[PDB]
Structure formats: structure tokens, C-alpha cells
Amino acid sequence: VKQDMPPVGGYGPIDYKRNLPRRGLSGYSMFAVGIGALLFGYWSMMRWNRERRRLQIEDFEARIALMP
Amino acid sequence: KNFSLRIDELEEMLTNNRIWRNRTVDIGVVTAEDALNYGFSGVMLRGSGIQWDL
DSSP states (O other): OOOOOOOSSSOOOOOOOOOOOOOOTTTHHHHHHHHHHHHHHHHHHHHHHHHHHHHHHHHHHHHHHHOO | OHHHHHHHHHIIIIITOHHHHHHSSSSOOOOHHHHHHTTOOTHHHHHSSOOOOO
16 A cells, blocks of 8 residues: 555645735824814813913912012 | 735735835846846846746
């Protein structure tokens, strides 16, 4: 009998092809994401700065009334 | 099977890179006159012009 190493009935298929997911996000919408986060931060920043100006004028009134 | 997947992940890593492409595009011009007179062999001849394979 003969006992070499053949392919056992023909092997299954072998992949070789390239693949890229191209993800993605449709980058103009990603610019919209960035500009939205930017303007979100500016809105909250504006609110906090004006409330802190209010409190800083209160500390001004403290130093004014305490002074004489 | 394993190696086809790993080399496609190497294409995922390196080929679509910004600064690696910027690192090797500008250099290494090879004119076909130079490729055939200066005795170049193999991958230079494939990568620069002439259709050639032993």
C-alpha cells in the first residue's frame, strides 16, 4: 500500500482578497458633529462667564462697602 | 487562512497611513532607461514600468 501525504479529496477554498470597511460616518456630517460640540461648549461657556461676572461684581461691592 | 487575514490587517495598519505615505512618495525615481542600463532586477523592474517576469 502507499502512504504519502496527498490532499484529502481536495481542500476547501482559500481566501486572498483585500478588504476595507470604509467606515466612514459621511465626514461632512462629522464636521457637523464637531461644529455642534463647539457651539454647545460656547453656549454653556457664555452662560457660566456671565454668571461669574455677576458674582465678581458682588465681590466688588463687598470691597467697596467695607473700605472706609 | 490565518495569514490572508493577518496580511489584510497589515494593509489596514500601514498602507492607508498619512505620514508613512508622505515618508515614501517623493523619492526613488527610476527611468526605464536607467532600469535597463544599470542592471536592475526583479522588484524594481516590476515597480517601474516594464512588464517582465521570469
